[PDB]
Every structure is written in C-alpha cells, then in structure tokens.
Design a protein around this ligand. Sequence first.
Ligand code: 7N1
Ligand code: MG
Lengths: 548, 409
Amino acid sequence: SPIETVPVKLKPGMDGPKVKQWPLTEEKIKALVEICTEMEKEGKISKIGPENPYNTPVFAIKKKDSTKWRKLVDFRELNKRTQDFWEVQLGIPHPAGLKKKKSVTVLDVGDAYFSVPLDEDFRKYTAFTIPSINNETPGIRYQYNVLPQGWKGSPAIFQSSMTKILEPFAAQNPDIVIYQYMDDLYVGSDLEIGQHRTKIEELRQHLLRWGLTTPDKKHQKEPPFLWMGYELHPDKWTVQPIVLPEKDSWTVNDIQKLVGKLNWASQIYPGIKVRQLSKLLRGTKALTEVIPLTEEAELELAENREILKEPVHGVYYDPSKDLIAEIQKQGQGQWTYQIYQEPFKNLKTGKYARMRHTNDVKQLTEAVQKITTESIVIWGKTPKFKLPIQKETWETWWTEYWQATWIPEWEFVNTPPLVKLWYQLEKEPIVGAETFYVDGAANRETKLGKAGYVTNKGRQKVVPLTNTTNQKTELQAIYLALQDSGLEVNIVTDSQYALGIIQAQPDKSESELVNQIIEQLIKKEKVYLAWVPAHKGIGGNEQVDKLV
Amino acid sequence: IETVPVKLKPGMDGPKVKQWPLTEEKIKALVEICTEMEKEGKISKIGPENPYNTPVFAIKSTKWRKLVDFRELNKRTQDFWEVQLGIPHPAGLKKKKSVTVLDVGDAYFSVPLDEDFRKYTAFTIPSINNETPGIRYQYNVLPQGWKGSPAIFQSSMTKILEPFKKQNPDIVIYQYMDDLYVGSDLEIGQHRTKIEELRQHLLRWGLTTPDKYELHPDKWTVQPIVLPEKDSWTVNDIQKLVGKLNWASQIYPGIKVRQLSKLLRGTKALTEVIPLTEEAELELAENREILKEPVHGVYYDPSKDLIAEIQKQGQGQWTYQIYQEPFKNLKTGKYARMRGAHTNDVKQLTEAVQKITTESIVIWGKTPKFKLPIQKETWETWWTEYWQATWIPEWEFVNTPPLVKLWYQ
Ligand SMILES: N#Cc1ccc2c(Oc3ccc(F)cc3OCCn3ccc(=O)[nH]c3=O)cc(F)cc2c1
Ligand SMILES: [Mg+2]
C-alpha cells in the first residue's frame, strides 16, 4: 500500500515479546501453511531469518463448521509491551441527532486492517513461528507487514489511515456527508438518486485505488438498517425489537439483562419505569442467586409490557426548527421526559431517577441538568424547557436553597401532577404558639430508646421506643411534638441531625418516620424549628434531657 | 533560540483527560482559532501515536478566546518546575495600596517548545454527536496556561523589566503564569499613568498586552465575627446568640456562656423577652472584646495546599474562608455583587471564585482548592460562561449543606 505508516514505539524499558510456541496437530499446521502462503503472496506477511529473537503464539480454528479455516494469533503479550495510542471512539452517534438525507449508503471495507501497512521498525516485534511435526525440522518464521488483527494499535491507526484517505474525496465533494465507524462508512447526501449512486461508485473506486475493497454489487445493506440495536428507516428511527422473557424464576443475571433492555428501550418508548425492578438489584450478591419478584416489581414490569405492545418511532433532527424538551413526574421519585421539535413526533425520550431524603423541585432541576448535558452532547445546543412548575414556586425554592442553581429559559405547562412547595417552615418564631422543647436518646447496645418533650405550658410527655437509634429517637421527638400541638408550634431540638434533615424541607424519603413528619408538617399552619447546643444547660432543653 | 529541555517526574506519564462536550457555537469558535494558530505555526495536527489529551474551552468581549485546562499537565510538570525554574513570591505585594493585573500571555507564543515535550500538550476539538473522532492538535510553542511557559520565559521577562524596575524601585512586580501583578502606594492617577508607562515600555520591547483590573490588598484582612446588637432580647435571640458563641468557642478559647445560659433557666416561650443581668451583659462584653481581636498562632504553611470554602448567603451575597487546617482561617471575606437585572447564582459564584483566587495569588503566590456549593454537572456545564481568568483553580463539590450559614454573616 502507498499509505503512509504510523510510527509506533514499545513502552519505555520494554522489549519485544519472546513467547513460547506450543505444538499443534498436523491438520492445523497444514492449514496454517495454506493460509500463510497466500498471505505472503499478497505481501501481508514475510518470512524472516534466524536473527529475530522474538515470537508470538499461533492457533488454528474452524470457522462456523465450514470449509475454510481461520488463523488466530494471541497478541495479548505484545499488547502489554506496545505504547498507548489515541483512544478510539467511546460513544456512537445517536439517531435522534442525525439529519434526514435523501440518500444513505452503507459501505463496509473488507480486510480493513490487512489493507493498511505497519511501521517498518516495529514489524520485527510481531514475529511468529509455525511449528514443525515432532520438532524434527526448524519452524517457519514469519512477521506482519500490515496491521495484525487483535493488536493494540490497529483500530486507531486504521481510523486515521481511513480519514487521511478520505480527505481528498471529501475535499472534491463538500455536499456529501461521510460518517466513519470501525469497518464501515455511512454516506448520506441530498443529491438525486442517480447522481448519488454515481458519487458512491466514485468513492468506491477511490477507496479501491487506495487498496480498500468495498461492496461491488448493489450495496449489501438496504433500509431499514439494523445498526447497534437500532432500526434506521429513511424518515424515522426506532430501536430493534425488545424481547421480555417469561420466567417463573429470576436470577440476578436475568434481572440485570431485563433492566438493560428496559433502559435501552426507554430512549424512545415513553413511560418506562425501572426503579422497582432495579430495587431488587440492591443485593450485590452472586449473579446466580434467585431473587423473588415483589408485587410492585411485577406491576411495574407489567406496565412496561403494556407500553411495549405497540411499536413507537422517533424522527430525525431539523436544525431550522426549535428544540423543545418537556418533563413529567411519575410519582415514585421517577421522572420522564420527551425531546421533540414536532407535536406528534419525538426526537427521543428518556428518564431520570434519584438514587441515594429529597424534594420534587430539586429532582426536577437535576433532571433539567441531565437533559441539558444530553442535549449538548447530541445536538450541540440546549433545549427550551416545558416544566410543570410555577415561577413563584421555583423562585421561592432557588432563592433560599443553599446550593447555587442554574435556571434556564422555561414556560409553565399546567399538566398534573404539578411540582409545588407542600410546606414551608417559619423564618421567625411564632408569637402565641406553644413551645415544645424536645429530645430523644437511645442505647447503642440494647437499642432501647425514648423520645419526649416539655412545653412552656407545663405539658410534658415521654414515650418509650424499642429497636431504635439515637438519630431515629431525635426525629421521633420532633414527630411527637408535632402530634400533640396545635396548628402553630415552636419546636426546639438539640439535634443538628434532625434539624438538618428537616431544614432541607423534603417531601419524600425512604424512611417512614420522616414521611409521617412530613405529613404533620403539611397539616400544620406554622412551624418554627429552632436549635440549641446540647448539654450547655441553657434551660428549657435541660429538663427534656433529664427526662429522657 | 534552542529550546529548553522539559522533563517529567520519574514514574509519571503524560496527561490523559477527557474532552468535555461543547456547544456548536464554541466548537466552531475553536475550529476557527485553531485554524489561525495552525496557520501561524503555533500548533500542528497529530496522529494516533499521541495518546495524551488536555481539555479545551471557549470563553470571552465580542471575540471568542480559547482556554486550555492545563491543570493535569501542571501537576505532572510544574511540581518539579516550581523547584528547578521556580518563581519566588514577594510578601510585600499584599501590603501595597493599589495592584493592577496585566495580561502578558502573548509573549509565550514567540518562544518555541521542547520537541520531545510537545506530545504532552495534545488537545482535541470535539465533534457533535460523536460524528467525527475530533480534531487533534499539539503545541509547537510555549502554551498559555502551562506553568512551564512563564518559567522558561522568566529570564527574558526579568531582562525586559529591569529598566522599568530601575526607574521605579518602589513598584512591586510579580509574575503568576500569564499575568503580571503590579503594586504601588502611588495615587490612583499616578498609579494608572505608571501602569501605562509599563504598558508602553513592554510594548516597545515587543510585548503586546490586550488591555488597550485594580485591587487594594492593604484593606484585605480576616474579618471579625459579628454578634447581633439588639435593644431587647427574646429567648430565641439569646438561643441563637449562645449557639453562635458556642460555635465561636471552637476558634477563640476563653468564650464562656454560663452567665448567658442561666438567663434562660426556666422552660419559656421562644418569643418571651428576657432582660439581661449583670453577669450576662458582662459576659457578652468580655466575649465581644475577645472576639474583636484576631486569632493567635495562625500561620501560613508552604507545604500545605490552600483550601477555600464558600457559602451562599442569599440576596446576591456570598461569604468565603481560606484556610489550611480547620478553624485556622488565613483569610476570610464576603463577596457581594450588584444584581442590576444581570446576575444569577452561577455568575455570582464564578466571579466569587475568581476574586478569591486572585486574592490568594496576591497574598501567597498560589491558588486554593475550592469546596463549591453547587452540583458537579451543573458547574461543569456552565462555569465557562463568566470565566474571565486565564488560570483554573482546583475544585470539588460539597455534599452536605451548612447549618453554619448565618454564623459567617
Ligand atoms: N448500518 C448502518 C448505518 C447506516 C446509516 C447511518 C447513518 O446515516 C447517515 C449518514 C450520513 C448522513 F449525512 C446522514 C445519515 O443519516 C440520517 C438519517 N437516515 C438514516 C438512514 C436512512 O436510510 N436515511 C436517513 O435519512 C448515520 C449514522 F450515524 C450511522 C449509520 C449506520
Ligand atoms: Mg440532650
């Protein structure tokens, strides 16, 4: 090949791989010779002298039980010693970000790696040896002239080689769009079908001039294109058919696969939920352990089965039209969103869920962040948001919130459920309201505890608790004060834990106690929570500590 | 001239950081800028045999400016290039009355970079939706943002500055990265004319400064803690007071709250007005007096990194503390900003971070690691919008909210 080679080094302080060549059966050696003679005939490999001190294992494997064999070289020992390269493409283009082209062609190049030469000085490190029968004769020495399959450098080097090869044609054809990906090229254009096919054949001839084969017949792939779990159709994109298995028993592996398929499907099928099914996966135990399906998980899975009944599709992107993203709440801390330019067509869909006390507004903002990141990645811009929240609500939240938040352009969309502030603590103490000095305490060993309160009106109470912690008693005290007070109450605690949890103003939690506390807070008119140093004998707090 | 050889720390490989996704606008700006820089020889395109990577961003003016995040490369080079070619830091810069910051980055672009080091300056212009692998460059000359650049240009800078220095022996000049900090005690007018004299001097010696920023570090001090002053006091007020004083006892030993604690002996309502006694008022007086004085035994440690904590106070105000060990504040302060139908939280936070970082540079000659009150991804998304600096401090994102919010107000 006239292609310019890329200079490759071994890792500093390392030498070429000197690895044993273990004997093979007669047929394997025969097939190896049969293949290597033809590879040598095409200049892909070359026999070498006894001077080469390195070596690399070689195996022979049948192909799908067929006539032609296949040569397999384990370069894992050489790969350790070769330098690092530019990291190859991590992610892939998302169909929602593609733009409609009147024509799209798939061109797969064969012998992609063997069609690109290897740096000369590095070729000696890829040396391997074909063994002889019973070691009665010297082995046949060989080395690669081109990019070996399974070598560390082959993908990146082939990538840059392809890019450099495409540069001229790309220059002489600015109105056509070529996408590169592994062994494939994807060429789109708005040219008329005849002109487009002409340009395609032109490209094919160019690539062939650079030694790269490409389908000669009417191109092997036609729409729809089954690509990376996607179905790419001329005017729409969707996912490949999802199959949800029917089983009486479910292991960790099966649930993981299921959550996989559901997540994968969630990018275009609106409403998919995975919280309850992945909540089964909290157990980090063995992958073969059979996990019993809960009722909530069963209901969830059933609802997903209902959603996946009829197929749904996504459209392609139009730069000339606005980019809109709308968010809806699903109730269980789950959120779903649609990204679209048109009313009945989604560009794509998605979900957000908060893992590891929180409130709706904060979660909403987090979702907005996720969608913003995704939008930037896919289309290179940020979407206009449609959100179920009042301006006064969100402003009230972000003003008094301890973290700094970025609130983008958004308009109110009145679609229940709505995000609102269910309750709000008083900023100043309440005149004409009873003052509950509360406290709670437990034993780290016996797990026996007690929570109580003392009020300025002379009212006192102590409630015993079993199987608890200091924290849970510290919350239980506040809960008690809330239970035994009027619509307006001044609570005073020494616990900065409890104060912290409550001042965050959550509307949901994975703790039933906190949920009850939240219920009480919603049911109240005014609630002022104050804090004082424990064991400082301030008074008011001392009697409650003495009690419990 | 022949290039200054640049070596890494033994055992350390080059930087391999991910490139952040960018808006189409910013990507186009970077493509433009890098096309021009490639045209001028400053950078060249590289192959797949270059594994290293350094993030790039686009900031601002009405003209897009490119900003390289060389933090990683700095930790992998300058840590041995603050030793070898290190730049000393004057302790008299903070004592001057007026300090102006000049941009002298454009100098570095004249000087070539060590051939064997260029591969570590690799950066990637990203593509939208992973369409193309990305445009890969490396620097051929001294890059802005790299701490090795002003270290290599150090001698040249000294040589150019020497005449002006001789004509102005009372002016302090300290170079941090791409910036020249010029401090004097002169009158504001005389100061600005002097800065302009330095501008013309530098310009007629071949150094352009795109200024065609004023600080006052003589007023900078560790702010004293303020106790609430009220005519009458309620139970709640005395509770907040005793609490705050008890918190302050972590810093000032000698704080007593017994006389104030006995004042709320009975279990009373939070809105009940309580008169102050003799022992109580005397205790408050003694506590205020001991609180007015600065802390004893607080010194800067050159072997320890600086830590900056910021907390949001609302109403367009932020408060910050700079320390090295807990409750040993080297420098506190409060950054406030006029809204004027302009500012939001992230803008204020960013400007705050820049102000704090500049103060930190002026005082100690290095930057603090911030604990920022903001969601990580939000910051990583929008921090480049109001960033006017050329350096980038280290940062991490605080998890739990502070209950100590009103204690710094
Ligand atoms: N196998 C495979 C395969 C085939 C086409 C692809 C593609 O295609 C495109 C290639 C270049 C371009 F400019 C625009 C494309 O897609 C715009 C959307 N679209 C898509 C398919 C179609 O039949 N019609 C159509 O309008 C873009 C892409 F990332 C990956 C592709 C992978
Ligand atoms: Mg107590």
